[PDB]
Amino acid sequence: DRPQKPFDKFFIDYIGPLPPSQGYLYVLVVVDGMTGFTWLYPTKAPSTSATVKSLNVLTSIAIPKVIHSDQGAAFTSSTFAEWAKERGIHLEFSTPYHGKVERKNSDIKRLLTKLLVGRPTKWYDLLPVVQLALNNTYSPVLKYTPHQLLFGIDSNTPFANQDTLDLTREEELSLLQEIR
Amino acid sequence: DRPQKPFDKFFIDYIGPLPPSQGYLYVLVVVDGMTGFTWLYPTKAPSTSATVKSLNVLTSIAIPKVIHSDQGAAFTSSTFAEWAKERGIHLEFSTPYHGKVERKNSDIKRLLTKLLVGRPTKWYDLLPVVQLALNNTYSPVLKYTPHQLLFGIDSNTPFANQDTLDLTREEELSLLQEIR
Amino acid sequence: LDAELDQLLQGHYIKGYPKQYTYFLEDGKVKVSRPEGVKIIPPQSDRQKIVLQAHNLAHTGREATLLKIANLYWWPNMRKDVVKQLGRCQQCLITNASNKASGPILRPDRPQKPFDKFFIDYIGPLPPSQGYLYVLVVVDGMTGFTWLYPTKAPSTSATVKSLNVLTSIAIPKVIHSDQGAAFTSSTFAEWAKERGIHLEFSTPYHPQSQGKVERKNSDIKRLLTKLLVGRPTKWYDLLPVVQLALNNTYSPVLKYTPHQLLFGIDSNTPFANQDTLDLTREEELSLLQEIRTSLYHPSTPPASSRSWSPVVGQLVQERVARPASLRPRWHKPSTVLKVLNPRTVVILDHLGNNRTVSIDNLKPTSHQ
Amino acid sequence: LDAELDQLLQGHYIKGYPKQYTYFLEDGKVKVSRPEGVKIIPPQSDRQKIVLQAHNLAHTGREATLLKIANLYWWPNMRKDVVKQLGRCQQCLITNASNKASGPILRPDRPQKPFDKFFIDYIGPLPPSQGYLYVLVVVDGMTGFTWLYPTKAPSTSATVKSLNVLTSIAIPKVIHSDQGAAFTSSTFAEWAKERGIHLEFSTPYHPQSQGKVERKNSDIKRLLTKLLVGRPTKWYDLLPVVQLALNNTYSPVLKYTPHQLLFGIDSNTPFANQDTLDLTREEELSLLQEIRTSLYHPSTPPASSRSWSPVVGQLVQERVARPASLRPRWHKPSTVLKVLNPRTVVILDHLGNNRTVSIDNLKPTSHQ
DNA sequence: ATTGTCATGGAATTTCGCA
DNA sequence: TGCGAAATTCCATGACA
DNA sequence: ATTGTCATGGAATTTCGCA
DNA sequence: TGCGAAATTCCATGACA
Ligand SMILES: [Mn+2]
Ligand SMILES: [Mn+2]
Ligand SMILES: [Mn+2]
Ligand SMILES: [Mn+2]
Ligand SMILES: [N+]
Ligand SMILES: [N+]
Ligand SMILES: [Zn+2]
Ligand SMILES: [Zn+2]
Incomplete structure (x- = not known):
């Protein structure tokens, strides 16, 4: 079997609804399977068309062989089916209700919360740094960060402090204050 | 003594008043002494300033060493004096009331009359052809026309018919009809 | 299969x-x-x-x-x-x-006589001076002798007005110009026919073809510039000065001013040349005929290493003149009817009209 | 006397x-x-x-x-x-x-790594498409990999918006541009300082200096043109297509697409190269580092037979940028302070300010 | 049915002034 | 039948469009 | 404080397929 | 160890400003 390469598989999924930030409510998460490289797109809905609009930007840079998703409404529509067929992208679905990728999805949910607290509205602007972080974070499995695996080079923004990622006491209580 | 060249002397004088033609009443006549080449300028007056305006055009092409004129008002003013001194042109006056040149002055007066008759107003437009005629007319003295003497070449408009120049019976009576 | x-x-x-x-x-x-x-x-x-x-x-x-x-x-x-x-x-x-250069330029023979050929063209618009915005430049082919007329527009009517004044001195055999509105109008055509003047035209969008006059425009503007340094740009009153200045300026390669080529003697202007003082006018005119024939004439330059010359029946394409934003810079292919000379052709523009066209406005369609 | x-x-x-x-x-x-x-x-x-x-x-x-x-x-x-x-x-x-040519062009070393240097620039105005009139072109120095963003104006704010989206992928060491209003504003400067991006600037009025991006603009326009033949010029929806098309196009001299220089493997696009199918990613990245170092680099061309190079203390004159009609095309003489390289100098513009200036915008004052 | 041109100022070459 | 410097000629460069 | 670049398609040169 | 043709490389030309 041929070894795994970048662009072999993109894993997509939505996160949200979030607090409104500059008119946006969700995040479309795209993680490359081989490299663990993450792309994020703000959307107003988890709809086929918010997906197609966003993937259109990404698929202007790189086209995956396969997209993998849950059986979310957005991804099982025949519009989205058409959209992929048009690009020779093959669709792949995890069965309803059922590695490297799943950790990344967890990291994103957690790293977001760590910063939305105190400013649940400013997340739009933070999406760029959130990504650089995610993509310049060392993998303990592979010796390399996804940036290095993607481009074959060190980055000019190394995140030398693999960070707390953890909610402190000031936050735990002001995140339990926001919820009330 | 050095032989006579073109630009050695320009002979100027006014002709008119004429019938109004496109707002103009006189002709300033400039005849080069050596060549017999004629330049004509329509003016509204025989004034220093109509003269200076006209000679300014001509003296943009060629500057004479000497201008010769009668003691006309236009030419004896100190303005006109100044104007010439400015250009290193020397002024020269025939004494009050007193060759090749004088014949030309006669030709012009006559050739004009030959064509102003029937149309005493259209002379402005005719000034160009009047000149070509005058300047492509053979001298019996010299073998050459003033065009040839000026440029050292044949012209593309030879006036092969040295013409009547003379007033016929139809004209004599319609010029005596205009005068009444 | x-x-x-x-x-x-x-x-x-x-x-x-x-x-x-x-x-x-x-x-x-x-x-x-x-x-x-x-x-x-x-x-x-x-x-x-x-x-x-x-x-x-x-x-x-x-x-x-x-x-x-x-x-x-x-x-x-x-x-x-x-x-x-x-x-x-x-x-x-x-x-x-294209990635193929035009063949090397022709250097046409200098007109033989003054008034054999005039090159004419307009300069402008310029800063308004006394309500005038253009300058009509007439350049005698043989002598370089140049006349200037301030105009309000580059119109047929302003052209005719000026040339009636000019032709009062002599009538030229030919007048060459570009395909400007002012010169191609039938009013101008009739003004020319009326005088036995032949109208000659530059192939379209190829100002090299009026090179004589385009080149003289440069001097006209350059000297106007120098003269207006630190002054406001009132150029109307300077046309007469520039005319005189230029007509009486030496061409270092010819060693003659255009004025001398025109008349064989300097007039009363500064630094007037006196060398023919002692000859009779006729001796002067005779030496002038000899000066006129022996003037320097440039020779066609070497072809660049990757040029093309036109061949009858070749597929070629004319350049789009004023191409809109994001539209093709070339017309569809067309066929070379006749090679008028190595730098000028007649093409059937597959509409099809006959067009006479410079090779500078042509590329040879690629891949046969 | x-x-x-x-x-x-x-x-x-x-x-x-x-x-x-x-x-x-x-x-x-x-x-x-x-x-x-x-x-x-x-x-x-x-x-x-x-x-x-x-x-x-x-x-x-x-x-x-x-x-x-x-x-x-x-x-x-x-x-x-x-x-x-x-x-x-x-x-x-x-x-x-002047009648002396600039000395021969430098060919700067290719950036060593992706994101070492970005060249950026605006294209437009263009026919309005969906209310957009410009295109922001970002070109990675080393790979040629190019991003396009439709804008309403060549403004600082539209530049920042687009680059925040782009830098979400990586942050570059340097960004080079011309001295356009949009890039020289302090708002942009602060956006750069905020990210440890060094702003590099082309000497004034010398687009050769952004040659990388100017050159890429040509392809962008050329392909947009081809694609819009006989259609109305709706270019907004085509930017994404052109981006992809160009990033995945071979440079005949390198034998690599910019995409391959960026990632070392083609993505799921037509005619994807398969030669490294069997290597592990690491074997691939190792072969990519070697490909990147051994790319073709042009050499500085021969000087033309009458060129000048700048010498410290020489009297030279800067070209007037947007010279008014009938006004001088050159500034008063000034003095060469420092020769930054054979094609770039610092002059004291006798006001006097220090200016860094290309020799293409300079003539050596004549007659000592 | 038409077609490049020529001022410019350093350099290259020729001529001059003198033996 | 030759030297140093001056005068002349050469000519690439750029700008008119 | 900075610096030209590269698709293109005929031609020139090298390599291939075959003895 | 050499031939004809095909493949590759060279590179001048032009257009981005
Ligand atoms: Mn989901
Ligand atoms: Mn009188
Ligand atoms: Mn013109
Ligand atoms: Mn640009
Ligand atoms: N000729
Ligand atoms: N460099
Ligand atoms: Zn001066
Ligand atoms: Zn095509």
Whole structure:
């Protein structure tokens, strides 16, 4: 079997609804399977068309062989089916209700919360740094960060402090204050 | 003594008043002494300033060493004096009331009359052809026309018919009809 | 189709496919083991669509197209099919640039006599001076002797007004100009016919063709500039000064001023040359005829290493004159009817009109 | 004055005036019998005013000035006085053209890594598409990999919006641009400092300096053109197509697409190269590092036969940027402070400011 | 049915002034 | 039949469009 | 404080396929 | 160890400003 390469598989999924930030409510998460490289797109809905609009930007840079998703409404529509067929992208679905990728999805949910607290509205602007972080974070499995695996080079923004990622006491209580 | 060249002397004088033609009443006549080449300028007056305006055009092409004129008002003013001194042109006056040149002055007066008759107003437009005629007319003295003497070449408009120049019976009576 | 590929699979030899390689079937397609790797040999019936899809990605030329195809396929004489396509892509043919230079410029003979040929042209618009915005420049071909007339517009009527004043001195055989509205109008044509003046025209959008006058415009503007330094740009009153200044200026290569070429003697202007003081006028005119014939004449320069000259029946394309934003810079291909000279042709513009055209406004359609 | 001319009249020898000729008085002036004719020798105290009057007629250069003077005068070493004047005529110095070419172009080293250097620039205005009129073009120095963003204006704010989206992928060391309003504003400066991005700027009015991106603009426009043939110019929806098309197009000289230089593997696009199928990613990245170092690099071309290179302390003049009609095309002379490289200098613009300037926007002031 | 041109100022080459 | 410097000529460069 | 670039398609040169 | 043709490389030309 041929070894795994970048662009072999993109894993997509939505996160949200979030607090409104500059008119946006969700995040479309795209993680490359081989490299663990993450792309994020703000959307107003988890709809086929918010997906197609966003993937259109990404698929202007790189086209995956396969997209993998849950059986979310957005991804099982025949519009989205058409959209992929048009690009020779093959669709792949995890069965309803059922590695490297799943950790990344967890990291994103957690790293977001760590910063939305105190400013649940400013997340739009933070999406760029959130990504650089995610993509310049060392993998303990592979010796390399996804940036290095993607481009074959060190980055000019190394995140030398693999960070707390953890909610402190000031936050735990002001995140339990926001919820009330 | 050095032989006579073109630009050695320009002979100027006014002709008119004429019938109004496109707002103009006189002709300033400039005849080069050596060549017999004629330049004509329509003016509204025989004034220093109509003269200076006209000679300014001509003296943009060629500057004479000497201008010769009668003691006309236009030419004896100190303005006109100044104007010439400015250009290193020397002024020269025939004494009050007193060759090749004088014949030309006669030709012009006559050739004009030959064509102003029937149309005493259209002379402005005719000034160009009047000149070509005058300047492509053979001298019996010299073998050459003033065009040839000026440029050292044949012209593309030879006036092969040295013409009547003379007033016929139809004209004599319609010029005596205009005068009444 | 499967025709040629079948005998190939068995191992019997077909022309074009080198026998020393091994051709097989796998996954449903005919393949081959080439040094760079394993490539699909498509059936000839498929090859066109392939070249097409490859070229169409970014509308690429020969190599950049070839390199895409060579990623998956191999077949005999690939570039031949690539080039066949390129020569048929309307969109590349009318949008790409040429990479072949015009042949070397002609240097036409100097008119033999003053008034044999006038070059005329307009300069402007310029900063308004006394309500005037243009300058009509008339340049006698042989002498360089130049007349200037301030105008309000580059109109036929302002042209006629000025030239009636000028022609009062002499009438020229020919007047050459560009295809400007002011000169191509029938009013001007009739003014010319009325005087036995032949109107000559520069091929379209090729100012080199009025080079004489374009070049003189440069001096006119350059001297106006110098004269107006630190002053406001009142150029109307300076035209007469510039006319005189220029007509009486030496051309270092000829060692004569245009004035001297015109008259054979300087007039009463500063630094007037006195060398023919003692000759009679006739001796002067005789020496002037000799000066006029022996003037320096440039020779046609060496062709650049990759130029083209036009050949009758060649497929060529005229340059789009004022091409809109994001539209092709070239017209569809057309055919060379007649070679008027190595730098001028008559083309049938496949509408089709006859057009006389400079090779500077032409490229030779690529790929035959 | 009469000083030197007196001893000359008597017949005793003075340095400069050849003894074999005969010098005399006539009409009040000192004259001399020269082969071309008889010429007035003015007193040295008069010679400057003469050269001046001659040059001032049409503001002529060396020979054309000399020839006027030689009509009446002769004195020793005339051109030396002529040239002294020319070098002092403010009006000729700032209006005349240069007749010396720039020295040969530098070919800077290719950035070593992706994101070492971005070249950025705006294209437009273009026909409005969906209310957009410009395109922001970002071109990675090393790979040629290019991003496109449709904008409404070439504004700082639209630049920042687009680059925040782009830098979400990586942050570059350097961003190079021209001195456009959008890039020189302090808002942009702070956006850069905020990210440890160094802003690099092209010397003024010298787009060769952003050559990388200017050149890529050409392809962008050329492919947009081809794609819009016979259609109305709706280019907004095509930017994404053009981005992809171009990033995945082979450079015939490199034999690599910018995409491959960026990632070392083609993505799921047509005609994807498969040669590294069997290597592990790491084997791939290792071969990519080697591909990146051994790319073709052009060499500086031969100097043209009459070029100039800048020398510290040389008198030079900067080109006027947007010169008004009939105004000088050059600034007053200024002095070369420092030669940054054979094609770039720092001049004291005699106001005086320090300016860093390309030699293409410079001429060496004439006559020392 | 038409077609490049020429001021410019350093350099290269020729000529001059003198033996 | 030759040297140093001056005068002249050469000519690439750029700008008119 | 900075610096030209590269698709293009005929031609020139090298390599291949075969003895 | 050499031939004809094909493949590749060279590179001048022009267009981005
Ligand atoms: Mn989901
Ligand atoms: Mn009188
Ligand atoms: Mn013009
Ligand atoms: Mn630009
Ligand atoms: N000719
Ligand atoms: N460099
Ligand atoms: Zn095409
Ligand atoms: Zn001057």
